[PDB]
Amino acid sequence: KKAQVISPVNGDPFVGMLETPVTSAPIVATYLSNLPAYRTGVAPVLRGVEIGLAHGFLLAGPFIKLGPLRNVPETAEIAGSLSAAGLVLILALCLSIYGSAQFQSTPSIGVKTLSGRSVARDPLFSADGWSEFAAGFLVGGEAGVAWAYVCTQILPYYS
Amino acid sequence: ASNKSFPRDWVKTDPLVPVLGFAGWTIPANIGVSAFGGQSLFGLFTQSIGENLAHFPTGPALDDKFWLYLITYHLGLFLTITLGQIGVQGRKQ
Amino acid sequence: MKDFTTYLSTAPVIATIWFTFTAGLLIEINRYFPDPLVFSF
Amino acid sequence: WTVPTLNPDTPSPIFGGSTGGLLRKAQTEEFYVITWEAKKEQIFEMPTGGAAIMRQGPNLLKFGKKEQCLALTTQLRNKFKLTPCFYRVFPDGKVQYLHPADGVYPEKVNAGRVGANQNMRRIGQNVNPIKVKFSGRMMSPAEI
Amino acid sequence: KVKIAVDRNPVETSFEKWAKPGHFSRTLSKGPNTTTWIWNLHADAHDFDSHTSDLEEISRKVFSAHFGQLGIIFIWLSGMYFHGARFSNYEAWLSDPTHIKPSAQVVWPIVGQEILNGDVGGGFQGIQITSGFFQLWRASGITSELQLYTTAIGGLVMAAAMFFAGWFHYHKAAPKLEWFQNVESMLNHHLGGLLGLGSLAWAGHQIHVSLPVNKLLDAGVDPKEIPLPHDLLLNRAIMADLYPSFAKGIAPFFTLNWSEYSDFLTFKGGLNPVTGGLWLSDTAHHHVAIAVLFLVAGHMYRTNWGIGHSMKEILEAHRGPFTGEGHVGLYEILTTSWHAQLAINLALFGSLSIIVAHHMYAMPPYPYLATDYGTQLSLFTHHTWIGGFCIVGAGAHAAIFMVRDYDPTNNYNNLLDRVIRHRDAIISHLNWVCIFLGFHSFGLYIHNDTMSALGRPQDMFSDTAIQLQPVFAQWIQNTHFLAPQLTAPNALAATSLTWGGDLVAVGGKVAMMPISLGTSDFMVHHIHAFTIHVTVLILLKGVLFARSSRLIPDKANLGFRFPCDGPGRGGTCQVSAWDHVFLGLFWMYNSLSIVIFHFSWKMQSDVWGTVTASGVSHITGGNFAQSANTINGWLRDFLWAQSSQVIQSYGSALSAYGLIFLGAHFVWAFSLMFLFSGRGYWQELIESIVWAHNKLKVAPAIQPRALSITQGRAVGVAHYLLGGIATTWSFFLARIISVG
Amino acid sequence: AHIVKIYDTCIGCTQCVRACPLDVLEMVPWDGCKASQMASAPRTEDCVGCKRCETACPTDFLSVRVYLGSESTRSMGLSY
Amino acid sequence: KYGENSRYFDLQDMENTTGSWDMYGVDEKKRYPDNQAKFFTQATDIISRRESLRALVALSGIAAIVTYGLKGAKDADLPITKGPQTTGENGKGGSVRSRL
Ligand code: CLA
Ligand code: CLA
Ligand code: CLA
Ligand code: CLA
Ligand code: CLA
Ligand code: CLA
Ligand code: CLA
């Protein structure tokens, strides 16, 4: 009764998205603004190392706990960390060839923000920016997995 | 139509919805029946919460007569708050 | 009664009647003459 | 009848916002824009799902592919008896007119049309595919 | 103002239209010219919306057709009671339920089928039944074949009554429309009258016949010496001998002193230890409470007096912030369309059937039911399958309502509208969860298979290696086993023995023992969840994309049933909602096959078996917890090990199953021609054979045409389901009739 | 783009035009039949090849054909 | 004008009427303390191109797998010179005829 929560995107009912308290709630919006993949003003190398540090450190775990070397003591950590570094390596290769295939042609035309003003295009979406991002990912991921081993070896009540 | 922009207040916070929620549900949740021998559905697993808070890192047993208290307690606590929030009769009833 | 006879003249009814006739005929022959394999007679 | 252009300040019908609107075929390649003038307010059916309310007067929509504009055109034409027209819009400010593109919808014959893709032989007077073999590309014998 | 509104003599009674096939529609009427017209005559016979366009006539049609269905059901029941009366060994079964197996069918001594007459015990020969009418009849109190014969005659009479009723209400007194559109009166009368008064009447019959007769039968006296039930009605003092509350008559009831009826209206929990069924006093008390509940519920709606609810008011009051106008406009949908009603009713009806199956194995209600293994397996399986088919039907008719009877002008901003308006989010997330469950639920089995074949059984998911415990179900199991001491203070036992506790053994065999849940149970349960979600995906996608989609913007104008929209835009085979129903049928087959396999093997491994007074020796030795994590485990221990009886049944009195096995396979493999191929090839081949007839002047003057695309698909799925289900039927019955 | 060709057995009954869901067919004046009309396909770059034009043609073996060819982003009917 | 009383489709303003918005994309500087720009951009200077890190992954992948062959002898469970320490199925070959 003269109360509604769910709205179409910025007016405009003819773009295939509609706004919900899942997508456009304020705390969710500010949260996903503050993630490194949406910042647009920083150099892509640094985003690469942040994202890599995060993903390597999380990728180390399951190989440690559930890998085929998980019951033999004191070497269950080594094989897991090494395998995780291998996975990060392959992810870096995937990023490189994606850069070779995606941005290989002309970019798009135009972009505006939601509360309309003409914002410029993100420099991550050019060939150079993406390649730099991939290098940052490799560095960050390997550093993260190495830190996972380090963190295992010196940590109060790890088990 | 439905709207043109998402309102950044959709949960209209009335401050005495939650306090009446759990305060007006727990003050009658600890009465005392013949059913438990003189105990409540808020003090009988206060014993439990503190009881397996004593031995801390051991997660409590997977048949221990108090998961029932947790589940049947929240099954009513959430319900009374979700019917309290529809005590926004500001335009409807 | 003419239309009832014409209804009895439709395809599935005559299929049912005629296959009942043929089936029953073979069944009776197999009762009174049990287990035929060769003709020799 | 000359070829008309559109006036992009006409209002749009009331609608809630579907999933099935414009995706990024519109951002890079093209999207189609339909226009008609109604006489009385009425509820019609979108060719994506849901129901919308057309306004008293000129209206305006936008769609992804062409079969959507043709579906809405057939529905608005055989059921409500109106005269819609839909355009093609490229994503830089280029507007192309189509349907009818002759003034008259293409069933009533309008003198002054040039017939294309119009062979002048019986269907079984085509050559064998051995006599069109070894050409620049794959060819059907009835394409020559 | 709800009242009677009937028209007089609308359609006269003559055989005139029986000699004019296809009289009902305008298209069919002109007579055949191809063989497509025969299949069109049979395809549109019950499509009552495709004769006319008026509600009243359709409603009268469906009313009289309902009468026809009821009549045929009565003929069926009458047949069952008659065959029980004349061609069975029911009395010899009552004399000794163990060691005498139920048989109710006798074959004629012809070409050699007389070997099918098995030695069922009791000086009788015939085919063992698993339908379990004998336990039902003993639960009702039937002791003689004469009463069965009388019931048979009564059933036949009621059948004739039903057919006459149908004739009367279509031809002589046919109701108007607004008779039908009084749904509130129908709700009151069904809820009160049918359900409630049926419960109350059956409670009466139990209290006055089934309690005492079964008390005497379980007391040990043979059935002939037991007094006839009219002596139990007429003589109060015999009931006073059995249950002393009856000596006080009906005085306790009317003065609210109900505590004195504690002799025949009880609340004890588990089972009858001498019988294996439920306590009949509980059953009577149950129907009494049911009847009071339903008779109370039936006075809810407004018919002619001011009291009661209106459906429109209730619906229109429920609307929130997240859903716009809420339910405004569902009453007009649900009183003017029959397919919507058929959808809802088939849905809840089929789900109800499956719940029937589950409760019916868990808490066996009939006397001497739990130790007849074949009956248990057959009843659970049968109700499972019927539930599945009905739910798929719900999907189909919801789709038909989406195509035909949906009008968006009366339905603007609404729950139905908003569901249509975010179908993309709905189907995308349902797709995601299907894939997630797929990978995990089936990859666990592939991983266990690989690890168990590579020499390392320590890296597979099992009870001894990496463990996956269903902690939730175990906790709920213990909760309900503990319920009679805290949360059900007045029961003497749990509601079933599967929640835990002791063992009930009747005649050496096991009635029910507690069931444990381990890792194999975890994995199979997630398999069930996976297949259910996939079927939901297909059917719900069919419903939502029935009117239009991004691919076809005008799919509504092509109708409900259509084959394609050409090879264009890539190719658009199978875009109708009908084909979504088709693929749904396949997946329903898959999911339910897994369910009944799970039940069969779990029961044979952890519940049934003999109490040899040396512990319990189950039928298959209890190998479910170790083998149900490898596909090789299922294929070997279940399919290959348990088929030894169905393949070696030749020469015994069980060979019909080992002979219908192969035929079921044959039909299954025969379906594939219809599924794989296409009709153009068959059209050309049929044309060449038509030439071979044109040579000899045997050209049929009706024209041979190949089947249409939709019919070819439908016939394919028909043969597929028939063959698969017949195979499973043969296998189950041979196995459990042989060793059970 | 596909290949749509109109042949001379056409009687000009406008069924193909009313069946086309993309407006690639139109009726042009002609002096070869009783109706003095004939179909034509001036816009075969919008055709998707659904073959409703073939289904709507009354004259036996058809007076209109749709030959399938190299697909594009418009002839696949892709809306995304 | 686009953002008005249901006046959609502004022809010259295409980036609204099309659906090309940045949903969650903010743009400002100083996300990081300054000298990580130094420590990480002077660290990824070598592999900052298409061929460079793509050569690096080749170098490391080879120098890892080839050495895994002959120094991944940390039991590999079975094969690597731990071998069959029992004469496993030499004479056991057939069931009816032995055949070795
Ligand atoms: C012929 C192809 C092939 C080969 C040779 C292997 C070989 C192997 N597989 Mg494998 N696999 C294959 C195909 C193959 N796979 C396919 C097709 C699949 C999909 C079905 C899988 C799925 C699969 C799974 C799921 C797993 C394996 C695992 C393994 C390892 C088992 C050895 C062991 O006991 O763990 C000993 C393992 C180690 C000692 C770790 C070595 C890690 C790499 C080889 C070293 C990397 C060096 C380092 C990162 C370089 C530094 C870079 C620098 C920038 C810092 C071994 C390396 C296991 C594994 O490694 O995961 C833990 C495992 O769990 N495989
Ligand atoms: C609906 C369930 C049902 C089923 C599945 C059966 C099945 C069977 N009954 Mg049975 N029966 C039923 C109900 C049923 N009955 C009822 C309700 C009664 C009480 C009236 C009986 C009384 C009964 C007796 C007394 C006997 C059987 C017997 C049999 C068996 C052999 C039947 C036979 O040889 O037919 C013979 C074949 C025919 C009669 C062919 C008739 C086909 C005609 C020509 C079709 C014409 C088409 C026409 C338009 C439609 C029919 C209309 C109708 C009004 C005639 C068979 C297992 C026999 C048995 O068990 O022996 C051991 C037996 O003696 N039944
Ligand atoms: C107490 C009254 C009463 C009772 C018992 C029923 C019972 C039934 N109605 Mg019903 N109905 C009622 C009032 C009642 N209705 C009213 C007031 C209306 C008008 C609003 C309708 C309108 C209605 C429609 C439109 C339909 C039904 C249908 C049905 C049947 C559902 C099938 C089923 O599961 O039955 C289980 C089977 C049985 C219980 C067998 C017992 C059958 C006997 C004959 C008891 C019937 C009592 C009878 C209605 C009382 C009047 C008898 C007559 C001689 C005056 C069921 C027999 C459906 C049906 O099947 O149509 C035939 C159907 O389509 N009813
Ligand atoms: C709905 C089913 C049902 C039915 C049919 C009955 C029927 C009966 N119960 Mg009963 N009962 C039921 C449910 C039922 N009960 C339930 C649910 C309970 C549990 C609370 C009980 C508990 C119970 C007890 C404890 C006792 C009975 C008893 C009786 C019998 C006598 C009732 C009595 O004292 O007079 C009640 C009076 C009437 C019902 C009036 C009947 C009016 C007649 C039928 C009208 C005929 C008029 C007509 C014009 C005649 C035509 C004349 C001409 C044509 C010839 C009677 C057979 C008593 C009995 O006999 O025990 C064996 C008894 O002691 N019942
Ligand atoms: C209460 C149950 C119920 C009712 C009343 C209806 C009623 C209807 N359905 Mg429906 N349906 C149901 C359940 C039901 N269905 C279920 C459970 C399913 C899922 C399988 C379907 C799936 C379904 C589809 C897919 C379609 C319908 C359609 C229809 C309509 C036309 C039916 C027709 O002409 O059949 C004519 C009768 C037949 C075709 C009989 C043939 C049935 C099979 C081949 C026989 C079964 C074999 C048998 C078990 C074993 C063979 C024995 C021996 C010969 C070997 C009609 C309104 C059609 C429609 O368009 O609606 C408008 C349609 O397209 N229904
Ligand atoms: C056994 C045969 C088989 C299999 C495996 C599938 C598999 C699938 N069908 Mg399916 N289908 C089949 C027969 C089969 N179908 C038949 C006969 C029909 C006709 C009725 C259908 C009709 C049908 C419909 C109508 C639908 C599906 C859907 C699905 C998907 C469900 C999601 C899922 O579980 O994916 C997970 C994948 C698997 C479980 C396959 C096994 C994967 C293994 C275990 C791990 C893979 C990792 C691999 C080893 C790594 C590769 C290494 C290599 C490169 C070296 C899935 C792709 C539904 C769908 O797509 O929506 C979700 C859907 O709508 N199918
Ligand atoms: C079980 C599997 C199976 C069977 C039985 C057949 C059978 C046949 N196929 Mg084949 N086919 C199959 C699978 C199968 N196919 C598959 C999977 C494919 C891939 C798509 C094909 C593709 C295929 C093609 C492309 C062609 C065939 C052809 C044929 C026919 C060959 C002639 C012949 O042997 O006559 C023997 C015929 C039979 C054994 C049919 C059974 C008839 C039964 C026994 C009579 C009915 C019994 C009883 C009355 C039924 C009562 C039930 C009642 C309710 C009606 C025959 C009908 C060819 C054909 O038609 O050439 C003439 C042909 O062109 N098939």
Is G25:A113 a contact under the CB 8 Å cutoff?
A: yes
Instruction: List the domain range (segments joined by +) for residue E157.
Output: 1-740
Write out the residues of chain D at the interface with chain A, using a CB-CB cutoff of 8 A: 12, 15-23, 27-28, 61-62, 91-92
Contact A29 G48 (CB under 8 A): no
Query: Using omega within 30 degrees of 0 as the cis cutoff, is the peptide bond preceding D100 cis?
Result: yes
Distance CA D11, CA D57 (A): 9
E672 Cα nearest atom in ligand 7: 17
* Closest C-alpha to ligand 4, atom 32: E250
Sign of torsion, CA G57 G60 G61 G62?
positive
Q: Measured between CB atoms, which of A16, A108, A109 is closest to D21?
A: A16
Q: Cα(D39) to centroid of ligand 4, in Å?
A: 72
E42 Cα nearest atom in ligand 5: 36
The 10 Å Cβ neighbour count of residue D16 is 22
Q: What is the DSSP string of E346-399?
A: HHHHHHHHHHHHHHHHHS--STT-TT-HHHHHHHHHHHHHHHHHHHHHHHHHHH
In sequence order, which residues have a C-beta less than 8 Å from that of residue E245 and are 6 or more positions away? E252, E260, E261, E262, E263, E264
Looking at domain C1-41, its CATH superfamily turns out to be: Single helix bin (1.20.5.510)
Q: Cα(E140) to centroid of ligand 3, in Å?
A: 24
Domain boundaries, chain C: 1-41
Structure tokens at G23: 């949903």
In sequence order, which residues have a C-beta less than 8 Å from that of residue E363 and are 6 or more positions away? E278, E495, E496
In sequence order, which residues have a C-beta less than 8 Å from that of residue G34 and are 6 or more positions away? none
Q: Do chains C and F touch (3 or more CB pairs under 8 A)?
A: no
Which of A4, A9, A12, A14 is most worth mutating to test chain D (most D CB atoms within 10 A of its CB)?
A14
Tokens 């043709």 belong to residue: D70
Which structural domains are found in chain A, ordered by start? 7-153 (1.20.1240.10)
Among candidates E151, E321, E451, which has minimal Cα distance to B7?
E321
C-alpha atoms less than 13 angstroms from C-alpha of E64 in its C-beta half-sphere: 21
In sequence order, which residues have a C-beta less than 8 Å from that of residue E424 and are 6 or more positions away? A16, D19, D20
CA distance D41 to chain F (A): 27
Structure tokens at E323: 């859903």
Distance CA B48, CA B73 (A): 13
* Closest C-alpha to ligand 1, atom 31: G76
Chain A hits for B2, CB-CB cut-off 8 Å, are: 4, 6-8
Beta-sheet pairing, G21-22 with A112-113:
parallel
Q: Cα(E79) to centroid of ligand 2, in Å?
A: 9
Contact B2 D17 (CB under 8 A): yes
Q: Where does G18-97 have alpha helices with state H?
A: 35-41, 50-71
The 3-class secondary structure across F6-69, one letter per residue, is ECCCCCCCCHHHHHCCCCCCEEEECCCCCCCEEEECCCCCCCCCCCHHHHHCCCCCCCEEEECC
Beta-sheet pairing, F26-29 with F3-6:
unpaired
* Closest C-alpha to ligand 7, atom 62: E685
Q: 3-state class of E529 per DSSP?
A: helix
E564 is in an annotated binding site: yes
Q: In a 10 Å sphere around its CB, with 0-12 CB exposed, 13-18 middle and 19+ buried, how is residue B88 labelled?
A: middle
Identify how the structure was determined. Answer: cryo-EM
Q: 3-state class of E579 per DSSP?
A: helix
Distance CA G1, CA E152 (A): 82
Q: 3-state class of G82 per DSSP?
A: coil
C-alpha atoms less than 13 angstroms from C-alpha of E632 in its C-beta half-sphere: 9
Contact A138 G56 (CB under 8 A): yes
Structure tokens at E715: 């016939």
Contact D107 F7 (CB under 8 A): no
Q: What is the DSSP string of E625-666?
A: HHHTTSHHHIIIIIIITTTHHHHS-TTTTTHHHHHHHHHHHH
Write out the residues of chain D at the interface with chain G, using a CB-CB cutoff of 8 A: 8-12, 14, 21-24, 26-27, 31, 33, 60, 62, 89, 91-93, 95
Distance CA E116, CA A98 (A): 70
Residue E418 Cα distances to A12, B40, E325, E537, F21, angstroms: 17, 45, 10, 18, 28
G63 Cα nearest atom in ligand 1: 50
Nearest ligand atom owner, CA of E721: 5
Q: Cα(E41) to centroid of ligand 7, in Å?
A: 25
Please give the helix or strand (H or E) that residue A27 lies within, else none: helix A26-33
Distance CA A17, CA A13 (A): 8
E691 is in an annotated binding site: no
Contact E568 F71 (CB under 8 A): no
| Ligand 3 near E661 CB (within 6 A) | no
Instruction: Give F 55-74 residues with CB within 8 A of chain D.
Output: 61-63, 65, 67, 73-74
Contact A40 G14 (CB under 8 A): no
Q: Cα(D99) to centroid of ligand 1, in Å?
A: 61
Nearest ligand atom owner, CA of E539: 6
Among candidates E40, E65, E38, E31, which has minimal Cα distance to E561?
E40
Longest CA span, chain D:
62
How many folded domains does chain E comprise? 1
Distance CA A21, CA A24 (A): 5
The 10 Å Cβ neighbour count of residue E488 is 16
Distance CA B72, CA B41 (A): 9
Residue C32 falls in which region: left (phi positive, over 0), alpha (psi -120 to 50) or beta: alpha
How many folded domains does chain F comprise? 1
Nearest ligand atom owner, CA of A79: 1
Q: 3-state class of D51 per DSSP?
A: strand
Contact B63 E324 (CB under 8 A): no
Chain D hits for A13, CB-CB cut-off 8 Å, are: 15-18, 21
A7 in contact with B, Cβ within 8 Å: yes
Q: Cα(E396) to centroid of ligand 5, in Å?
A: 10
Q: Measured between CB atoms, which of B1, B2, B91 is closest to A2?
A: B91
Instruction: Give E 435-494 residues with CB within 8 A of chain A.
Output: 456, 459, 466
Please give the helix or strand (H or E) that residue E174 lies within, else none: strand E173-175
Distance CA E135, CA E141 (A): 10
Q: Cα(E646) to centroid of ligand 2, in Å?
A: 29
Among candidates E111, E7, E132, E94, which has minimal Cα distance to E57?
E7
Q: 3-state class of E6 per DSSP?
A: strand
D17 in contact with B, Cβ within 8 Å: yes
